[PDB]
Coordinates of C-alpha atoms in Angstrom, one line a residue:
Chain A
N62 CA -8.5 274.4 -57.4
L63 CA -5.7 276.5 -58.9
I64 CA -4.1 278.9 -56.4
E65 CA -1.5 280.6 -58.6
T66 CA 0.8 281.4 -55.7
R67 CA 4.2 280.2 -54.6
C68 CA 6.3 279.8 -57.8
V69 CA 9.1 277.3 -57.8
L70 CA 12.2 279.1 -59.2
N71 CA 14.7 276.3 -58.8
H72 CA 15.1 273.4 -61.3
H73 CA 14.6 269.9 -59.8
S74 CA 17.0 267.0 -59.8
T75 CA 17.1 264.9 -62.9
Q76 CA 17.7 261.8 -60.7
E77 CA 14.0 261.8 -59.8
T78 CA 12.9 261.2 -63.4
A79 CA 15.6 258.5 -64.0
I80 CA 14.1 255.1 -64.9
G81 CA 16.0 253.7 -61.9
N82 CA 14.1 255.8 -59.3
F83 CA 10.8 255.6 -61.3
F84 CA 11.0 251.8 -61.1
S85 CA 12.4 251.4 -57.6
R86 CA 10.6 250.9 -54.2
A87 CA 9.2 247.6 -53.0
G88 CA 5.6 247.0 -53.8
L89 CA 2.8 244.4 -53.0
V90 CA 2.4 242.2 -56.1
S91 CA 0.5 239.3 -54.4
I92 CA -1.4 238.3 -51.3
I93 CA -1.8 234.6 -50.5
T94 CA -4.0 233.1 -47.7
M95 CA -3.8 229.6 -46.4
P96 CA -6.5 229.4 -43.8
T97 CA -6.9 226.0 -42.0
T98 CA -10.0 224.8 -43.9
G99 CA -12.7 226.2 -46.2
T100 CA -12.5 226.2 -50.0
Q101 CA -8.9 225.9 -51.3
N102 CA -6.8 224.9 -48.3
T103 CA -7.6 221.3 -47.3
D104 CA -4.2 221.1 -49.0
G105 CA -1.7 223.2 -47.2
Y106 CA 0.5 224.5 -50.0
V107 CA 0.4 227.3 -52.7
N108 CA 1.9 227.7 -56.1
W109 CA 2.3 231.3 -57.1
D110 CA 3.5 232.1 -60.6
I111 CA 5.6 235.2 -60.3
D112 CA 3.2 237.5 -62.1
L113 CA 3.9 241.2 -62.6
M114 CA 0.8 242.2 -64.5
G115 CA -0.9 241.7 -61.2
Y116 CA -1.6 245.3 -60.2
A117 CA -2.6 247.6 -63.1
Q118 CA -0.6 250.5 -61.4
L119 CA 2.7 248.6 -61.9
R120 CA 1.6 247.2 -65.2
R121 CA 0.7 250.5 -66.8
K122 CA 4.1 251.8 -65.7
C123 CA 5.9 249.0 -67.5
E124 CA 3.8 249.0 -70.6
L125 CA 5.4 252.4 -71.2
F126 CA 8.2 250.4 -72.7
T127 CA 8.4 247.5 -75.1
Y128 CA 11.4 245.6 -73.8
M129 CA 12.7 245.6 -70.2
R130 CA 15.5 243.8 -68.3
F131 CA 15.9 243.6 -64.5
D132 CA 16.7 241.8 -61.3
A133 CA 14.1 241.5 -58.6
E134 CA 14.0 241.3 -54.9
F135 CA 11.3 239.5 -52.9
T136 CA 10.3 240.0 -49.3
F137 CA 7.9 237.8 -47.4
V138 CA 5.6 239.4 -44.8
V139 CA 3.7 236.7 -42.9
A140 CA 1.3 236.8 -40.0
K141 CA -2.1 235.2 -39.2
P142 CA -5.2 236.8 -40.8
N143 CA -5.4 239.1 -37.9
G144 CA -1.8 240.3 -37.6
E145 CA -0.7 237.8 -35.0
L146 CA 2.5 236.0 -35.3
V147 CA 3.0 232.5 -33.9
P148 CA 6.1 230.2 -33.8
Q149 CA 5.2 228.4 -37.1
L150 CA 7.9 227.1 -39.4
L151 CA 7.5 228.0 -43.1
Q152 CA 9.0 226.8 -46.4
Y153 CA 9.1 228.8 -49.6
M154 CA 10.4 226.9 -52.6
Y155 CA 11.4 228.6 -55.8
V156 CA 10.3 226.6 -58.8
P157 CA 12.5 227.7 -61.7
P158 CA 10.9 228.0 -65.2
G159 CA 10.6 224.6 -66.9
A160 CA 10.6 222.9 -63.6
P161 CA 8.1 220.5 -61.9
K162 CA 5.7 222.3 -59.6
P163 CA 4.3 220.8 -56.4
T164 CA 0.8 219.3 -56.9
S165 CA 0.4 217.8 -53.5
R166 CA 1.1 219.1 -50.0
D167 CA 4.0 216.6 -50.1
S168 CA 4.9 216.1 -53.7
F169 CA 8.5 215.0 -54.2
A170 CA 8.7 218.4 -55.9
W171 CA 9.4 219.9 -52.4
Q172 CA 12.6 217.8 -52.0
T173 CA 14.2 218.5 -55.3
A174 CA 17.6 220.1 -54.6
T175 CA 17.5 222.2 -57.8
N176 CA 14.4 224.0 -56.7
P177 CA 16.0 226.3 -54.1
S178 CA 13.9 226.6 -50.9
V179 CA 14.1 229.0 -48.0
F180 CA 13.2 228.2 -44.5
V181 CA 12.1 230.7 -41.9
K182 CA 10.0 230.8 -38.7
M183 CA 7.0 233.0 -38.6
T184 CA 8.5 235.0 -35.7
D185 CA 11.7 235.4 -37.7
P186 CA 12.0 238.8 -39.5
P187 CA 10.8 238.7 -43.1
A188 CA 12.6 236.5 -45.6
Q189 CA 14.4 238.3 -48.5
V190 CA 15.7 237.0 -51.7
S191 CA 17.0 238.2 -55.2
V192 CA 15.8 236.4 -58.3
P193 CA 17.9 237.4 -61.5
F194 CA 17.0 237.8 -65.1
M195 CA 15.6 234.4 -65.9
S196 CA 14.6 235.2 -69.5
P197 CA 16.3 233.2 -72.3
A198 CA 16.1 236.3 -74.5
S199 CA 18.2 239.4 -73.9
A200 CA 15.2 241.1 -72.2
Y201 CA 11.6 240.7 -71.1
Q202 CA 9.0 242.1 -73.4
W203 CA 5.5 243.2 -72.6
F204 CA 4.4 242.8 -76.2
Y205 CA 5.0 240.1 -78.8
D206 CA 3.2 240.9 -82.1
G207 CA 3.7 237.3 -83.2
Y208 CA 2.8 233.7 -82.4
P209 CA 4.9 231.2 -80.4
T210 CA 4.0 228.2 -82.6
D219 CA -5.1 232.0 -82.8
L220 CA -5.5 231.7 -79.0
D221 CA -1.8 231.9 -78.4
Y222 CA -1.4 235.3 -80.1
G223 CA 1.0 237.7 -78.4
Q224 CA 2.0 235.2 -75.8
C225 CA 5.7 235.3 -75.3
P226 CA 6.9 232.3 -73.1
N227 CA 10.5 233.9 -72.9
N228 CA 9.1 236.0 -70.1
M229 CA 8.2 233.1 -67.6
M230 CA 9.9 234.2 -64.3
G231 CA 9.3 231.2 -62.1
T232 CA 6.9 230.1 -59.4
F233 CA 6.9 230.3 -55.6
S234 CA 5.8 227.3 -53.6
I235 CA 4.6 228.3 -50.1
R236 CA 3.5 225.9 -47.4
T237 CA 4.0 225.1 -43.7
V238 CA 6.7 222.5 -42.7
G239 CA 5.7 219.3 -41.0
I240 CA 4.1 216.0 -41.8
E241 CA 0.8 217.2 -40.3
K242 CA -1.2 220.3 -41.3
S243 CA -0.6 223.7 -39.6
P244 CA -3.1 224.6 -36.9
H245 CA -2.9 228.2 -37.9
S246 CA -4.5 230.2 -40.7
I247 CA -1.9 232.2 -42.6
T248 CA -1.9 235.2 -45.0
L249 CA 1.4 236.5 -46.4
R250 CA 2.0 239.6 -48.4
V251 CA 4.5 239.4 -51.2
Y252 CA 6.6 242.5 -52.0
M253 CA 8.7 242.8 -55.1
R254 CA 11.4 245.4 -55.9
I255 CA 13.1 245.8 -59.3
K256 CA 16.8 246.3 -59.2
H257 CA 19.1 247.2 -62.1
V258 CA 16.6 248.5 -64.6
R259 CA 17.1 249.1 -68.3
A260 CA 14.3 250.0 -70.8
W261 CA 14.2 250.3 -74.5
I262 CA 11.5 251.6 -76.9
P263 CA 9.0 254.0 -75.2
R264 CA 5.4 253.5 -76.3
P265 CA 2.0 255.4 -75.8
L266 CA 0.5 255.2 -72.3
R267 CA -2.6 253.2 -71.6
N268 CA -5.9 255.2 -71.9
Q269 CA -8.5 252.4 -71.7
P270 CA -9.5 250.2 -68.7
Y271 CA -7.5 247.0 -68.7
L272 CA -9.6 243.9 -69.3
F273 CA -7.1 241.0 -69.4
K274 CA -3.7 240.1 -68.0
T275 CA -2.5 238.5 -71.3
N276 CA -3.6 241.1 -73.8
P277 CA -4.5 244.8 -74.5
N278 CA -8.2 244.2 -75.2
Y279 CA -10.5 247.2 -74.4
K280 CA -14.2 247.7 -74.1
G281 CA -14.9 249.0 -77.6
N282 CA -18.5 249.8 -76.7
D283 CA -17.2 252.3 -74.1
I284 CA -14.1 254.1 -75.4
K285 CA -13.0 256.8 -73.0
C286 CA -11.5 260.2 -74.0
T287 CA -7.9 260.7 -72.8
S288 CA -8.8 264.2 -71.5
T289 CA -12.0 265.6 -69.8
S290 CA -14.4 267.6 -71.9
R291 CA -15.7 271.2 -71.7
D292 CA -18.5 273.3 -73.1
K293 CA -16.8 275.6 -75.6
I294 CA -13.2 275.7 -77.0
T295 CA -13.0 279.1 -75.3
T296 CA -14.7 278.5 -71.9
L297 CA -11.6 278.1 -69.7
Chain B
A6 CA 10.6 265.1 -95.6
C7 CA 9.7 265.4 -99.2
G8 CA 7.7 268.4 -100.3
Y9 CA 7.2 271.2 -102.9
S10 CA 10.3 273.0 -104.2
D11 CA 12.8 270.1 -104.1
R12 CA 14.8 268.9 -107.1
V13 CA 13.1 265.8 -108.5
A14 CA 15.3 262.7 -108.4
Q15 CA 15.3 259.1 -109.7
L16 CA 16.5 256.5 -107.2
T17 CA 17.3 253.1 -108.9
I18 CA 17.9 249.8 -107.0
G19 CA 18.2 246.6 -108.9
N20 CA 15.6 246.3 -111.7
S21 CA 13.5 249.0 -110.2
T22 CA 13.3 252.8 -110.2
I23 CA 11.1 255.4 -108.5
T24 CA 10.8 259.1 -109.4
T25 CA 11.0 260.5 -105.9
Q26 CA 12.0 264.1 -104.9
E27 CA 15.3 264.5 -103.1
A28 CA 14.5 265.9 -99.7
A29 CA 17.2 265.6 -97.1
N30 CA 14.6 265.3 -94.4
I31 CA 14.5 261.6 -93.6
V32 CA 13.4 260.0 -90.4
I33 CA 16.0 257.7 -88.8
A34 CA 14.4 255.4 -86.3
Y35 CA 15.8 255.6 -82.7
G36 CA 18.8 257.4 -84.1
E37 CA 20.2 254.2 -85.6
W38 CA 21.4 252.9 -89.0
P39 CA 20.5 249.4 -90.3
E40 CA 23.6 247.2 -90.0
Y41 CA 24.9 243.6 -90.2
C42 CA 24.2 241.5 -87.0
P43 CA 27.0 241.2 -84.4
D44 CA 28.7 237.8 -84.0
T45 CA 26.3 235.3 -82.3
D46 CA 27.3 231.6 -81.8
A47 CA 24.4 230.5 -84.1
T48 CA 25.9 232.1 -87.3
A49 CA 29.4 230.8 -86.3
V50 CA 28.9 227.3 -87.6
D51 CA 26.1 228.5 -90.0
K52 CA 27.0 231.9 -91.6
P53 CA 24.0 234.2 -92.4
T54 CA 22.5 234.3 -95.9
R55 CA 22.4 237.9 -97.3
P56 CA 20.6 237.8 -100.7
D57 CA 21.5 241.0 -102.5
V58 CA 19.9 239.5 -105.6
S59 CA 16.2 240.4 -106.1
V60 CA 15.7 241.1 -102.4
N61 CA 17.5 244.4 -102.3
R62 CA 15.3 246.6 -104.5
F63 CA 12.2 248.8 -104.3
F64 CA 8.9 247.1 -103.6
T65 CA 5.8 249.2 -104.3
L66 CA 2.6 248.2 -102.6
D67 CA -0.8 248.6 -104.2
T68 CA -1.9 252.2 -103.8
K69 CA -4.6 253.0 -101.4
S70 CA -7.5 255.4 -102.0
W71 CA -8.0 258.1 -99.4
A72 CA -11.5 259.4 -99.0
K73 CA -13.1 261.9 -96.5
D74 CA -14.1 259.1 -94.2
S75 CA -11.0 256.8 -94.3
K76 CA -10.0 255.7 -90.8
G77 CA -6.5 254.7 -91.4
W78 CA -4.4 251.7 -92.5
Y79 CA -1.5 249.6 -91.2
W80 CA 1.0 246.9 -92.2
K81 CA 2.9 244.3 -90.4
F82 CA 6.6 243.6 -91.1
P83 CA 8.0 241.4 -92.3
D84 CA 4.6 239.8 -93.0
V85 CA 3.8 242.3 -95.7
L86 CA 6.5 241.1 -98.0
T87 CA 6.5 237.5 -96.8
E88 CA 4.2 236.7 -99.8
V89 CA 6.1 239.1 -102.1
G90 CA 8.9 238.2 -104.4
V91 CA 12.1 236.4 -103.5
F92 CA 11.7 238.3 -100.2
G93 CA 9.1 235.7 -99.5
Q94 CA 10.5 232.4 -100.5
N95 CA 13.9 233.5 -99.1
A96 CA 12.4 234.5 -95.7
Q97 CA 10.4 231.2 -95.7
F98 CA 12.9 228.5 -96.7
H99 CA 15.3 230.2 -94.2
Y100 CA 14.4 229.6 -90.6
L101 CA 15.8 232.8 -89.0
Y102 CA 15.4 236.3 -90.4
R103 CA 16.8 239.8 -89.8
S104 CA 16.5 243.1 -91.8
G105 CA 16.2 246.9 -91.5
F106 CA 14.1 249.1 -93.8
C107 CA 13.8 252.2 -95.9
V108 CA 10.1 253.0 -95.8
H109 CA 8.7 255.6 -98.1
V110 CA 5.1 256.9 -98.0
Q111 CA 3.7 259.2 -100.7
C112 CA 0.5 261.1 -101.5
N113 CA -0.5 262.7 -104.8
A114 CA -2.9 265.6 -104.6
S115 CA -3.9 269.0 -106.0
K116 CA -3.1 272.3 -104.3
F117 CA -6.9 272.5 -103.7
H118 CA -6.9 269.4 -101.5
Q119 CA -6.2 269.4 -97.8
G120 CA -5.4 266.7 -95.2
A121 CA -3.0 265.6 -92.6
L122 CA -1.4 262.1 -92.4
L123 CA 0.6 260.9 -89.4
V124 CA 3.1 258.1 -90.3
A125 CA 4.8 256.2 -87.6
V126 CA 6.4 252.8 -86.8
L127 CA 5.6 250.8 -83.7
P128 CA 7.6 247.9 -82.5
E129 CA 5.5 244.9 -81.4
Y130 CA 2.2 246.2 -82.5
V131 CA -0.2 243.9 -80.7
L132 CA -3.9 244.6 -81.2
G133 CA -7.0 243.9 -79.1
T134 CA -10.7 243.2 -79.8
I135 CA -13.8 244.9 -78.4
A136 CA -14.6 242.2 -75.9
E142 CA -15.0 238.6 -73.1
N143 CA -11.7 237.0 -74.0
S144 CA -10.9 236.6 -77.7
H145 CA -7.5 237.1 -79.4
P146 CA -7.8 239.0 -82.7
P147 CA -8.1 237.0 -86.0
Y148 CA -5.1 235.9 -88.1
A149 CA -6.3 238.0 -91.0
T150 CA -6.1 241.3 -89.1
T151 CA -3.1 240.4 -86.9
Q152 CA -0.9 239.6 -90.0
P153 CA -2.7 241.4 -92.9
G154 CA 0.1 240.9 -95.4
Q155 CA 0.5 243.1 -98.5
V156 CA -3.0 244.7 -98.6
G157 CA -2.8 245.8 -95.0
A158 CA -5.8 246.3 -92.7
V159 CA -8.0 249.3 -91.9
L160 CA -8.2 250.8 -88.5
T161 CA -11.6 250.5 -86.8
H162 CA -11.0 252.7 -83.7
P163 CA -8.0 254.9 -84.7
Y164 CA -8.5 257.0 -81.5
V165 CA -7.0 254.3 -79.4
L166 CA -5.1 252.7 -82.3
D167 CA -7.1 249.4 -82.0
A168 CA -4.9 248.7 -78.9
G169 CA -6.4 250.7 -76.0
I170 CA -3.7 253.3 -76.4
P171 CA -4.1 256.9 -77.4
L172 CA -3.2 258.0 -80.9
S173 CA -2.7 261.4 -79.3
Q174 CA 0.6 260.0 -78.0
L175 CA 2.0 258.0 -80.9
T176 CA 4.6 260.6 -81.8
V177 CA 6.7 259.1 -79.0
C178 CA 7.7 256.9 -81.9
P179 CA 9.5 257.4 -85.2
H180 CA 6.7 259.4 -86.8
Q181 CA 6.6 261.6 -89.9
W182 CA 3.8 264.1 -90.8
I183 CA 2.3 264.6 -94.3
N184 CA 0.5 267.9 -94.6
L185 CA -0.6 268.3 -98.2
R186 CA -0.4 272.1 -97.7
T187 CA 3.4 271.6 -97.6
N188 CA 5.3 268.3 -98.1
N189 CA 3.5 265.2 -99.6
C190 CA 5.6 262.3 -98.8
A191 CA 7.6 260.8 -95.8
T192 CA 10.7 258.5 -95.4
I193 CA 11.7 256.3 -92.5
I194 CA 14.9 254.3 -91.8
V195 CA 14.2 251.4 -89.5
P196 CA 16.9 249.4 -87.7
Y197 CA 16.2 245.7 -86.7
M198 CA 14.6 245.5 -83.2
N199 CA 14.3 242.3 -81.2
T200 CA 15.4 240.5 -78.0
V201 CA 17.5 238.2 -80.1
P202 CA 19.6 238.7 -83.3
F203 CA 17.5 236.4 -85.5
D204 CA 13.8 235.7 -85.0
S205 CA 11.2 233.8 -87.0
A206 CA 10.2 235.5 -90.3
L207 CA 6.7 234.0 -90.2
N208 CA 5.6 233.9 -86.5
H209 CA 6.8 237.2 -85.2
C210 CA 6.3 240.7 -86.7
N211 CA 9.0 243.0 -85.3
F212 CA 6.9 246.2 -85.9
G213 CA 3.8 247.7 -87.5
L214 CA 3.5 250.6 -89.9
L215 CA 0.7 253.1 -89.4
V216 CA -0.7 255.8 -91.8
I217 CA -3.4 257.7 -90.0
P218 CA -5.3 260.8 -91.1
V219 CA -5.3 263.0 -88.1
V220 CA -6.9 265.8 -90.2
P221 CA -9.5 264.3 -92.5
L222 CA -9.2 264.8 -96.3
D223 CA -11.2 267.8 -97.6
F224 CA -11.9 269.2 -101.0
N225 CA -14.8 270.8 -102.9
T226 CA -16.8 268.3 -104.8
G227 CA -15.8 268.2 -108.4
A228 CA -12.1 267.6 -107.5
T229 CA -10.7 264.0 -107.3
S230 CA -12.5 262.4 -104.4
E231 CA -9.9 259.8 -103.6
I232 CA -6.2 260.7 -102.9
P233 CA -3.7 257.9 -103.6
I234 CA -1.3 256.8 -100.9
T235 CA 1.5 254.8 -102.4
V236 CA 4.1 253.0 -100.2
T237 CA 7.4 251.8 -101.3
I238 CA 9.6 249.5 -99.2
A239 CA 13.3 248.8 -99.3
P240 CA 15.1 246.2 -97.2
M241 CA 18.4 247.2 -95.7
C242 CA 21.1 244.7 -94.8
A243 CA 18.7 241.7 -94.8
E244 CA 20.2 238.4 -93.6
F245 CA 18.8 234.9 -93.2
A246 CA 20.0 231.9 -91.3
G247 CA 19.4 228.5 -92.8
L248 CA 20.9 226.3 -90.1
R249 CA 21.9 223.5 -92.5
Chain C
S98 CA 5.4 254.9 -137.6
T99 CA 8.9 255.4 -136.3
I100 CA 11.9 256.3 -138.6
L101 CA 13.5 253.3 -137.0
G102 CA 10.7 250.8 -137.4
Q103 CA 10.9 251.7 -141.1
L104 CA 14.6 251.5 -141.8
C105 CA 14.6 248.0 -140.4
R106 CA 12.4 246.8 -143.3
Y107 CA 15.3 247.8 -145.5
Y108 CA 17.6 245.3 -143.7
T109 CA 17.5 241.6 -142.6
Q110 CA 19.3 241.2 -139.3
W111 CA 19.8 243.7 -136.5
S112 CA 20.3 244.0 -132.7
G113 CA 21.1 246.5 -130.0
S114 CA 19.4 248.6 -127.3
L115 CA 16.4 250.9 -127.8
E116 CA 15.0 253.6 -125.5
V117 CA 11.3 254.3 -125.3
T118 CA 10.2 257.6 -123.9
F119 CA 6.9 258.7 -122.5
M120 CA 5.9 262.3 -122.3
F121 CA 2.8 263.4 -120.3
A122 CA 0.9 266.4 -121.7
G123 CA -2.0 266.8 -119.3
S124 CA -2.6 270.1 -117.3
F125 CA 0.1 271.3 -115.0
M126 CA -2.4 270.8 -112.1
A127 CA -2.8 267.0 -112.3
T128 CA -0.7 264.4 -110.5
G129 CA -0.6 260.6 -110.3
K130 CA 1.7 257.6 -110.8
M131 CA 2.1 255.1 -113.6
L132 CA 4.0 251.9 -113.5
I133 CA 6.1 251.3 -116.6
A134 CA 7.2 247.7 -116.8
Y135 CA 9.4 245.7 -119.1
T136 CA 8.7 242.0 -119.6
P137 CA 11.9 240.4 -121.1
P138 CA 11.8 238.0 -124.1
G139 CA 10.3 234.7 -123.5
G140 CA 8.8 236.1 -120.3
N141 CA 5.2 235.9 -119.2
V142 CA 3.1 239.0 -119.6
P143 CA 2.3 240.7 -116.3
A144 CA -0.8 239.2 -114.7
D145 CA -1.6 242.4 -112.8
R146 CA 0.1 245.5 -111.3
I147 CA 1.7 243.6 -108.4
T148 CA 3.2 240.7 -110.5
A149 CA 4.7 243.4 -112.7
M150 CA 6.2 245.3 -109.9
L151 CA 8.5 242.4 -109.2
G152 CA 10.0 242.6 -112.7
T153 CA 12.1 245.4 -114.2
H154 CA 10.0 248.5 -114.0
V155 CA 9.9 252.3 -113.3
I156 CA 7.3 254.1 -111.1
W157 CA 6.5 257.4 -113.0
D158 CA 5.1 260.3 -111.1
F159 CA 4.2 262.6 -113.9
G160 CA 3.4 265.1 -111.2
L161 CA 7.2 265.4 -110.9
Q162 CA 8.6 264.6 -114.3
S163 CA 6.6 265.4 -117.4
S164 CA 8.7 262.9 -119.2
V165 CA 10.4 259.6 -118.5
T166 CA 12.6 257.1 -120.4
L167 CA 12.9 253.4 -120.4
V168 CA 15.6 251.4 -122.1
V169 CA 15.1 248.0 -123.6
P170 CA 18.4 246.2 -122.8
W171 CA 18.6 244.1 -125.9
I172 CA 16.6 242.7 -128.8
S173 CA 17.6 240.6 -131.9
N174 CA 16.1 239.8 -135.3
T175 CA 17.2 237.1 -137.6
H176 CA 14.8 237.1 -140.6
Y177 CA 13.9 233.9 -142.5
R178 CA 11.2 232.6 -144.9
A179 CA 8.8 229.6 -145.0
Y185 CA 7.9 234.4 -143.4
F186 CA 8.8 234.3 -139.7
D187 CA 10.9 236.3 -137.3
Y188 CA 13.6 235.0 -135.0
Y189 CA 12.8 238.2 -133.1
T190 CA 13.9 238.0 -129.4
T191 CA 11.9 240.9 -127.9
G192 CA 10.3 241.9 -124.6
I193 CA 7.0 243.6 -123.9
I194 CA 6.1 246.9 -122.3
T195 CA 3.1 247.5 -120.0
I196 CA 1.8 250.7 -118.5
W197 CA -0.2 250.3 -115.3
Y198 CA -2.1 252.8 -113.3
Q199 CA -0.1 252.8 -110.0
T200 CA -2.4 255.4 -108.6
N201 CA -5.6 256.9 -109.9
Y202 CA -5.4 260.0 -112.1
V203 CA -5.7 263.1 -109.8
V204 CA -6.9 266.6 -110.7
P205 CA -8.4 269.6 -108.9
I206 CA -11.5 271.5 -110.1
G207 CA -11.0 273.2 -113.4
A208 CA -8.6 270.8 -115.1
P209 CA -9.4 268.2 -117.9
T210 CA -10.2 264.8 -116.5
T211 CA -8.5 263.1 -119.5
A212 CA -4.8 263.6 -120.5
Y213 CA -2.5 262.1 -123.1
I214 CA 0.9 260.5 -123.4
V215 CA 3.1 260.5 -126.5
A216 CA 5.5 257.5 -126.8
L217 CA 8.8 257.8 -128.7
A218 CA 11.5 255.3 -129.4
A219 CA 14.9 255.0 -131.1
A220 CA 18.0 252.9 -131.2
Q221 CA 20.9 253.4 -128.8
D222 CA 24.6 253.6 -129.9
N223 CA 24.9 249.8 -129.8
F224 CA 22.2 249.1 -132.3
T225 CA 23.3 247.8 -135.7
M226 CA 22.0 246.3 -138.9
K227 CA 23.2 244.1 -141.8
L228 CA 22.1 242.7 -145.2
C229 CA 20.0 245.1 -147.2
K230 CA 16.8 244.2 -149.0
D231 CA 14.1 246.3 -150.7
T232 CA 11.2 246.8 -148.4
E233 CA 7.6 245.7 -148.8
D234 CA 6.3 249.1 -147.6
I235 CA 5.2 250.4 -151.1
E236 CA 3.3 249.1 -154.1

């Protein structure tokens, strides 16, 4: 509707609009499930590449800028598929960029001291960690108009943020099915170069391809330029 | 920037001159002036090469004809000049590259013509196909001198509204008034020196928001000449 | 046809700078750009508009200036017989930078008048009766 009543006669706080508060708040970026046995769990481990272009809502927000630098905070919510918590010991290993990722439920990859791991019981309150600005360049960039050497067009490897190796501790397999929600919160934000906002459904994580057969108009349509 | 009622000038740089009208209405990208790269350990044991020879002059690109149905054009930097003059062999034989730009856009039309051209610069101008997966070709991703034509100017061939491109260093050309634009562009990267061949720091767009109109019998194609001038262009050899 | 071109025939050697001017006469309603380009002595003649833009030139918007001047930097002639000229001279090319533009009502064909002359550093020596008459 449009109830033209109750007019706000007081200016609002500029803090609200500040990039800091715009890109604050923890948010779900990934959901991993390690049930006992079915399709992809006769293993007992998971390798999750820290991916931000996971949920379009977050992504479209970032894409508003060309280059962005920031620290991140991760929190691990874990419980069985039905919300129940059991006394199961877990291990989350952080595999830094350009570092060997577990391939087996017991790869030596899990013992490497340089790959920092965090231990926590399922009953323990959520595990929290802060992962810095791993990029080799002065800032992350959502766009790279060049080539890093074509199928590898626009791919910038200077953005790789690392991987998270989850799994249950113990020689044997875990008797429980797990499903953990990964929350991420950007700290210390800085953005440069503001660009036009997305106006076409996203079709790929790596590029800005759009369904050219169906190009949608940014604003709804009406009958006449005067019907209002 | 440049329009009717402005004292005609003659800017000369090197072995080249352009008769452009002096109009103190130039666009200065992100409020910055093109300067000489701040000390970085790489150019500490390998000082940067700054050819002021035949690299600092006025490059004029082959004019483009503007017809009632033209959809737009675009150029990638530094790709555009990579094949042109010493700016090419210099940018090629030298690994790293870094430079700012004086970008001049200019129409030539009668006072009986009408049209509106938006002229903006866009850092990291990645493009996307119509799709299934398929990264754009190499001929449209890095068009070079000739440039490439826009196919879907409404989303800028990148799934993003044209309606919002003014959030970038833009400049309007409204035949009814001015007839030429000018833009100062400072080097923009995530590192002081990048690769002059692989990466294109930004793209130049010339889109006709308001189509070109005239009454038949008048020149049917309006020229759009673009002149480029490098500012404080350095190169790292690493040898 | 120039006063200069003639008075040279009355001498043997000579050298200095020259300035060639171009004056557009079309209707005050037309616009367009021309690319005046000088190709130095011993140089290769412009292949096309782009290969000439990289050499010494001057973009001439006759929509702004109805006249424009170019200056030949230097030329030299050392006359000898065997008849040959030790003439060290460059070439000039006029290219259509942009198409010729005009609205409805104005002539679709205009004209340019070219004019030259020596500059203050041009000199001559050794007289000799010309071969201009009979």
